[model samples]
Target: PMPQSWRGVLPCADCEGIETSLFLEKDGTWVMNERYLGAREEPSSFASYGTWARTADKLVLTDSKGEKSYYRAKGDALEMLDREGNPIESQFNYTLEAAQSSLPMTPMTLRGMYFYMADAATFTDCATGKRFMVANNAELERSYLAARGHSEKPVLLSVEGHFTLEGNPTKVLAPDTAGKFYPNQDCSSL
Candidate 1:
């Protein structure tokens, strides 16, 4: 009944449609991907990630390139909006559905921020821009906990990690190595 992941096909000028997938996180992070249908007879895809916010009637998204897109919530779906935050009046479909059990994630290098709490931690992947609960990596937790300077602040980190479908959404785990932590950096360039 709530918004998690949304997907649908958008109107395309030179192609059949654009397959759009949007994933939102609770901590102002967002990741979206688009696939152009019939691109040179081969489908081409692209992805971007950045911060997001929401209002009572709209969802505001900004990508890494500093460009913003707009959407309005419509119960179980989200209706895409124009650049100026107006409803796109078109005959074609512009709504992304929110029916999903879990996000589609693969094993890859995770570079993002680690924000620890008293009970657990969250890892927001830089490339994917998805957040996951931390588990099974005690050393990573120990180092993060030992950093007395990072009080209630997110620490930039890089790890070779993957995820599992064991939590409410998912959890991040380092399958191989521990990771590097940078106290004076951000994911803006990565």
Candidate 2:
């Protein structure tokens, strides 16, 4: 299966970076969540949901107000293209790397999913290869215990209950049901 979810930390003009994630659904639905990292006050969060379509190597997402955004699939990342279908030059990674899990269902509140155990964090989405993080906490420990005895594979988990752009990288709030593992298979490469 291909990856339907794409995530990355894009450079932000006002904040440290923009934690952006885009999830494409099988039924033509699409949802995008962006959290502005590092603000004096509360970090900003923006969400938009609408329909998405594919045209050649590009995927077009139309928002509720009929506004459209375009992206081009590049390897395991989704490059956000300009209005003219051109790329923006930047040293920082502008593309959202594919998350590990390719579960069939799209999560309602998760920005990224990972498998955690011990002191290691694994972003298991096959298309994106492996991404790891380090942070040990109660949530990861508890969830790992729960799934460890039950399944041979490490327990799958949501990065946190909500998508936050900053703060402790190792902290995750809760575990999602297995159904949340479903990815938007349609958006795999395109």
Candidate 3:
């Protein structure tokens, strides 16, 4: 009846669980954030943006690349649905519970490697180990230059950050708060 945001820890194939969050905007846009749990040595985190539609009992998410996911909404929770919007026939808990949803990416801490080599900046998130283009980072660039006095190589960085809802390359990192630079280190060091 109100703005619906869902969250859950669902079972994963190779990890502990998938820490998943879904935020639905009234205008049809949505954001999904999932982090692989128990990936101590190779934690993976991903954020997705897309358009979503829901019938009285069903929910479907179509991501930026047109990939669609299915789910069922019932009784304060959303259950994962397979290709045909049918509840997954399994013994696992493929469900997410309703919660107060905040903006997908908010003030959060991030530790990663940062560098530039092309048209845009790149951040190799140490948490997910994926390279995400950095956006709205005018100040981040300035601080990087100050600390990176004489280099273009990757540096380990720790800061408060989040993901922006839009970007030319799809998902991009948006670091709002600045943390110190590890001038002598890279992701491997951590």
> Considering every candidate listed, which one attains the maximal lDDT?
3
Candidate 1 has a TM-score of 0.44
lDDT of 2 by residue, 1-190 (tens): 3469998998877879888889999998999999887865463788889999987778889998899888888679788888798987677557888787423333344333455555555544334444444244555555555655655454444443321222553333333443233222211332
- Rank all candidate structures by their lDDT, best first, as comma-separated numbers: 3, 1, 2
Tens digit per residue, CA lDDT, model 3, 168-190: 62767777776678887777785
The C-alpha RMSD of each candidate to the native structure, in angstroms, is 22.7, 21.4, 20.9
lDDT of each: 0.77, 0.62, 0.79
Q: Tens digits of per-residue lDDT for model 1 on 1-190?
A: 3577999998788888889999998887989899998876454988889998788778888889889889888897798899677787767567988886653455567788887777677887777788777675677877776752747688888877566656544455544567688877879954
- Residue pairs in clash, model 1: none
lDDT of 1 at 124: 79
Off by over 4 Å in 2: 41-43, 91-190
